[PDB]
């Protein structure tokens, strides 16, 4: 499967009258989920749970109301799987992948923010045709190209391609030139943006060089972050 970050505390019980929420994001077969653990550290039960997202850069929104039938009792912990889609209202956020959230129960409402890893927004149909790749790489202005060092990665090309493909980043071509592997890759976001990539792998260097071309180059740093996470994990 694709890379899933370990759950992080998004709402600590000290800030939320005893309610702790830890979470992560998954994306299996195009279905995006916010996977959470709610823990009641308090002395009273908790009921009447609901959640709301603020508008955000990629229009992420829950697909259903929160799934919680019975009271969450003192010292109880439950796993909550919230399906999301990208058909919701859009507002540019800073950082670009910031999500503002409000969760309420019977005691209060609690606001927090978390970061959506961009890889959960990589769609399954993100393999560019080869002819189109060549034309697009030429056509996108060279001033849009941004380069990044993926440091202390020493996986071979085949392993890199496989890990990336498992995360919907497709290898369109692989060439060996002057003893260096050059991997040409594509991916597409849920909002239709294509990113094209060249990944350079040498004997000699500890670091791979990632060059990214995108018509919205603001997204490139976030793509780098998740390349780095996928290849390191």
């Amino acid at each position: 499967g694709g890379y899933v970050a370990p759950k992080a505390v998004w709402l600590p019980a000290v800030k939320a009258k005893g309610l702790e929420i830890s979470g992560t994001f998954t994306h299996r077969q195009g279905h995006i989920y916010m996977e959470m653990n709610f823990t009641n550290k308090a002395l009273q039960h908790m009921t009447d749970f609901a959640i709301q997202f603020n508008k955000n850069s990629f229009g992420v929104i829950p697909s259903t109301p929160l799934a919680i039938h019975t009271p969450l009792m003192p010292n109880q912990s439950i796993d909550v799987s919230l399906p999301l889609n990208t058909l919701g209202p859009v507002m540019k956020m800073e950082p670009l992948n910031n999500l503002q959230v409000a969760v309420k129960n019977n005691i209060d409402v609690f606001y927090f923010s978390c970061l959506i890893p961009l890889n959960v927004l990589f769609v399954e149909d993100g393999k560019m045709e080869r002819q189109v790749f060549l034309a697009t790489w030429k056509d996108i202005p060279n001033e849009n190209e941004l380069q990044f060092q993926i440091k202390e990665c020493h996986l071979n090309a085949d392993t890199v391609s496989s890990k990336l493909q498992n995360n919907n980043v497709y290898t369109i071509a692989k060439r060996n030139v002057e003893g260096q592997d050059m991997l040409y890759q594509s991916l597409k976001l849920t909002n239709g943006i294509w990113i094209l990539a060249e990944l350079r792998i040498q004997p000699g260097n500890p670091n791979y060089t990632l060059s990214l071309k995108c018509r919205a180059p603001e997204v490139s740093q976030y793509i780098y972050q998740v390349y780095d996470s996928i290849l390191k994990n």
Partner: peptide, 16 residues
């Protein structure tokens, strides 16, 4: 197959 391997090798060459 699609004949385009040579074009990709030229692209790679042009950037080294």
């Amino acid at each position: 197959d699609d004949g385009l391997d040579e074009a990709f090798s030229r692209l790679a060459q042009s950037r080294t």
